[PDB]
Amino acid sequence: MLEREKIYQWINELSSPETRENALLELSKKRESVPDLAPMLWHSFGTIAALLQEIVNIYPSINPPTLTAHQSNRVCNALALLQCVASHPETRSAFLAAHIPLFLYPFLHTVSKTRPFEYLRLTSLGVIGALVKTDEQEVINFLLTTEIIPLCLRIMESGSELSKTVATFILQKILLDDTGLAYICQTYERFSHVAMILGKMVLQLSKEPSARLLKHVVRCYLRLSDNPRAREALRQCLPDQLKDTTFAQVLKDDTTTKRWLAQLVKNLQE
């Protein structure tokens, strides 16, 4: 009972800027303990507009990169609430129709390696991640037309171990869709851009390993082998580190990733 009242109060407190900051903090942490939080956020008057205001207010501090720890903490609570709106089945289609991801694209364009920026990009990726996990064709077709693949690949190449995992995960969920695989493999340009980054990643992974990032890079390579045009291209460009005993030690524990790489090499044979 009392628990819900506290939540309803905070949702209503998001509407006035005088209480918005604290209401963001309290709700962003109670986020996982409240299952129906997303439709409560969605069907409360001017709650989404308040969340989007928190995003647009931070735009002048993005470029030039003058975003502070406090500024980042505040916007990342708002982005966390959008993350859960993106996840929920009742609100996901409505969130996409409201083009909410387009507000995060400036954040994903940032390169500043400061923690306020690290957190901003990671939380923003988490929103796209939440949207893709739902394995919805409509999400995929949105993402394909909005040029997220370039933004992901930039992060995938030169981001934090985890933000790289999250961006690779977003690429993976696109590639898993038939239309997504068809799109990336449609032109040599598109495929070559993806494969080059994926390969570059295998090389950094062979130096500084990440058993979770390798799991997603392997799944990406394996999914590309489903397209014959990509399979033939991969017969030439596949990193030698995936063919030999490089990752054999780190994959002693991961029997699933071990299976994927075993299937990939078999798929490439013929």
Binding site: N73, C76, L122, L162, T165, R212
Partner: peptide, 22 residues
């Protein structure tokens, strides 16, 4: 505040770590 940033980052890290898991 900067001490809280590192915490909130670590929390997001752990959160997204479970999201990518399949």
């Amino acid at each position: 505040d900067d001490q809280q940033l590192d915490h909130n980052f670590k929390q997001m890290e752990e959160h997204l770590a479970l999201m990518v898991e399949g």
